[PDB]
Amino acid sequence: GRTTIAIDPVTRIEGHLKAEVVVENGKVVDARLSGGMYRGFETILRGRDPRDASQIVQRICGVCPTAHSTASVLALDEAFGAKVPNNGRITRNLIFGANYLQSHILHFYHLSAQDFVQGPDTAPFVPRFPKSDLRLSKELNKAGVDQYIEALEVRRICHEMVALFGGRMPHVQGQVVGGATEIPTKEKLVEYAARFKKVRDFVEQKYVPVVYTIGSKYKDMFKVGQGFKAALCVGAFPLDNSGKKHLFMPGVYAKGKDMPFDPSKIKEYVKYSWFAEETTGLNYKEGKTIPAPDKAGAYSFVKAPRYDGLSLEVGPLARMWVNNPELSPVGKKLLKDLFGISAKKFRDLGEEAAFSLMGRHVARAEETYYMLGAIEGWLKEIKAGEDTVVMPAVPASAEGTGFTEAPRGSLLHYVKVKDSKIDNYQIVSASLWNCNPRDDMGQRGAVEEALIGIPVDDIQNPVNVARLIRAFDPXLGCAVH
Amino acid sequence: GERPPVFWLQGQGCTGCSVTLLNSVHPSIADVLLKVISLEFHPTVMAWEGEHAIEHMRKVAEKFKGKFFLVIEGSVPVEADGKYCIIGEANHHEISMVDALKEFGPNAAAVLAVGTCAAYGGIPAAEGSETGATAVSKFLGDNGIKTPVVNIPGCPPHPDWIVGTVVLALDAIKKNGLEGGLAEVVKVLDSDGRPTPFFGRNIHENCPYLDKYDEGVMSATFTDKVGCRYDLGCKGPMTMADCFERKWNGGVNWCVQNAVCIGCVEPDFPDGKSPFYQA
Ligand code: SF4
Ligand code: SF4
Ligand code: SF4
Numbered sequence A: 001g002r003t004t005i006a007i008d009p010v011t012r013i014e015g016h017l018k019a020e021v022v023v024e025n026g027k028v029v030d031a032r033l034s035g036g037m038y039r040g041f042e043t044i045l046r047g048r049d050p051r052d053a054s055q056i057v058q059r060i061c062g063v064c065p066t067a068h069s070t071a072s073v074l075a076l077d078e079a080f081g082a083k084v085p086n087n088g089r090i091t092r093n094l095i096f097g098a099n100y101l102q103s104h105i106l107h108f109y110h111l112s113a114q115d116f117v118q119g120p121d122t123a124p125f126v127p128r129f130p131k132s133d134l135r136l137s138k139e140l141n142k143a144g145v146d147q148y149i150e151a152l153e154v155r156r157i158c159h160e161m162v163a164l165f166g167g168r169m170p171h172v173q174g175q176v177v178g179g180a181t182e183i184p185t186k187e188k189l190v191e192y193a194a195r196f197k198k199v200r201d202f203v204e205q206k207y208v209p210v211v212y213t214i215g216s217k218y219k220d221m222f223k224v225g226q227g228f229k230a231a232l233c234v235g236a237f238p239l240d241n242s243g244k245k246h247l248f249m250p251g252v253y254a255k256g257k258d259m260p261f262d263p264s265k266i267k268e269y270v271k272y273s274w275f276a277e278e279t280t281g282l283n284y285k286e287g288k289t290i291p292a293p294d295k296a297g298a299y300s301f302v303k304a305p306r307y308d309g310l311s312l313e314v315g316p317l318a319r320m321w322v323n324n325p326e327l328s329p330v331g332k333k334l335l336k337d338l339f340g341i342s343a344k345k346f347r348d349l350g351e352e353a354a355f356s357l358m359g360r361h362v363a364r365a366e367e368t369y370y371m372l373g374a375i376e377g378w379l380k381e382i383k384a385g386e387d388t389v390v391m392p393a394v395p396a397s398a399e400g401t402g403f404t405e406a407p408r409g410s411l412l413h414y415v416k417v418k419d420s421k422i423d424n425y426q427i428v429s430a431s432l433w434n435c436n437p438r439d440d441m442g443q444r445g446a447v448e449e450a451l452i453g454i455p456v457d458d459i460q461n462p463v464n465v466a467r468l469i470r471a472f473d474p475x476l477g478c479a480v481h
Numbered sequence B: 001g002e003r004p005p006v007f008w009l010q011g012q013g014c015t016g017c018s019v020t021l022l023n024s025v026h027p028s029i030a031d032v033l034l035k036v037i038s039l040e041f042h043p044t045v046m047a048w049e050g051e052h053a054i055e056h057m058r059k060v061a062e063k064f065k066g067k068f069f070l071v072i073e074g075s076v077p078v079e080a081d082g083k084y085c086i087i088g089e090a091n092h093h094e095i096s097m098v099d100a101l102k103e104f105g106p107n108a109a110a111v112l113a114v115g116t117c118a119a120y121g122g123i124p125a126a127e128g129s130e131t132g133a134t135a136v137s138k139f140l141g142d143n144g145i146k147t148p149v150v151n152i153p154g155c156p157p158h159p160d161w162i163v164g165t166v167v168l169a170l171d172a173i174k175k176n177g178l179e180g181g182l183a184e185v186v187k188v189l190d191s192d193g194r195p196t197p198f199f200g201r202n203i204h205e206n207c208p209y210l211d212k213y214d215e216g217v218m219s220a221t222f223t224d225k226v227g228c229r230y231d232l233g234c235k236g237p238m239t240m241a242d243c244f245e246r247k248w249n250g251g252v253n254w255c256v257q258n259a260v261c262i263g264c265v266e267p268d269f270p271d272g273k274s275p276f277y278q279a
């Protein structure tokens, strides 16, 4: 028989998602993802003072607002010809870097961990599926719960770090076209570093080890969820002012091959999305956003981006695979001890294990560890008291594009200015790449494809469907905007 | 005592109102969840999912009819028969935000419109939008639903405003019972539905830079922290919030110190507060 299962809302993600799968002989054989909420930032932005964008766009998503802030101010910097002071570049990295820490910790503990961990007998940890496939021993489960509780404090401290130079969080005030609004003082750098030390201790001693340790009780979860095994990185965190070096370098990986990233090859399709048919197939520089919520055959407010025709994924796995950094000391040790795997660099996990449900959780933990080194570097590089902003005039006519990597994956903002106002603003976000529907030729989106093959041995307790989805840390607010 | 049941519905929100709550310092969010409220439905953090999550909310709603608190995060879009915001599916029917607020709103003890989107419409209702994004009080009124509404705006609100408003309500209810207590809460709301303990004071008249404003000494760059921020766009004069005192994120900064106030707690945010970076 063929069993259709619809899950709406998919919980413990950001935003509004319906997943519908078909199960046959205990495995998912088809999937459709529907982003069910639309706001239309791309039309709301039109007609405004372009400087307003770097506030307005943050409200796309209160979990990843610094990513949109960053993409917007980079786009505006380019459009305005604003020359961000070196110290302002480093200050922006400290603001944004701190939220990477918050977002990954939030995601693993407060969104994902209940997939593997039974919480206390009170809402919102009960009720849940009668057969939730929760495999951890009493001791390891309790460690999960205790770390979930500790992580609530740690993620909050990450937002104190963001706010020190960012003003407040969610929705920073501190990034604008031209740099950062507040020069770091010696005193506030001490405050940032003291908080950073606590977060670092938690990431190193609790978070990275627990992901591997839980992973080791769910080794079957490294054997599913591969999908297309194709990844995108557009680059992020400029490490100099020349714009030549980034903490994450850009690139594309598909069919076992690495290749450079060319943004001119991005097109957004809408056949299966609730937008006007005539807007299909547009590159973002000519993008259009015309909602069509009654359009026959469509099933999502997420457009379908394809890179030179390819359906790609983004996020920590994509970045870590493309950049192939050395693994954390913890990871090297626990891969040996718990998995019998000898590995030095990320790709030593192998393609099959890296592009897997549990692989994506591993990548996110490893990336969090990696970001610690980056932030430590910026705290050494930053110079207390040195100016962080310039104050450029608004241009009458201009365009610019900002590229960066949000915690969930590749993000770009494009702005066109005419008569000193926003004429067009187009956003191509991380979860847009992961959580999109079919394109005009019927090729599935990355998560839709990754669902194929997922085990559902009990249709009454189909827990692995949302487990796979959550591994991608979906954000439907970002995906649709 | 028994923690009241809370259902947290997200309409056209960004999850920033949920995240800001997670930043509560005293009490911590852990203490809020375990000791203050019973958060029975919340799509971002709850264990269960899908139709089962919806049906759990429905079971609790029936058991606690008239007694649960309904938090709304995000606006409610009325265009296209509610299709711009689908929040669930159960009994093979899609549930829009419109449907959900019509279902649960009439049976709530009170509706807490958390954030400027829910309170006033906010960014989804701003110029250029086309979803019919609607504020909670207007939507309920338009649909004949008479349940008391308390607005806790901000984009996002400070966690202290959210937790503090819940505590205001719990104190009043302990003293007067449910209906009586909620009546006492409604008496301390301003004309925009906001609790006066958090929104009864003006940013500007309490601003540390007021002396500079009065002297006409204005910063010409954001990083000049001596001058008043008025020429840089500060909307403090038109804004009613206590940010100048409690500040943000464990007291480490606030908008006027760091940059400018954008008036995020006001009913006309964003359009009436824009452009942000000019007076
Ligand atoms: S009020 Fe602001 S922070 Fe809250 S849901 Fe709306 S856009 Fe997000
Ligand atoms: S900085 Fe803003 S709130 Fe403070 S005195 Fe100047 S205009 Fe008023
Ligand atoms: S200072 Fe102004 S913009 Fe900042 S949180 Fe307070 S009211 Fe909102």
Ligand code: FCO
Residues within 6 Å of the ligand: A061, A064, A067, A068, A406, A407, A408, A409, A410, A411, A429, A430, A431, A432, A474, A475, A478, A479
């Ligand atoms: N992280 C994040 Fe948000 C998404 N997806 C963006 O961009």
Ligand SMILES: [Fe+2]
Residues within 6 Å of the ligand: A042, A426, A427, A428, A429, A481
């Ligand atoms: Fe877009």
Ligand code: NI
Residues within 6 Å of the ligand: A014, A060, A061, A062, A063, A064, A475, A477, A478
């Ligand atoms: Ni997001």
Ligand SMILES: [S]
Residues within 6 Å of the ligand: A063, A064, A065, A066, A067, A068, A099, A100, A103, A406, A407
């Ligand atoms: S972010």
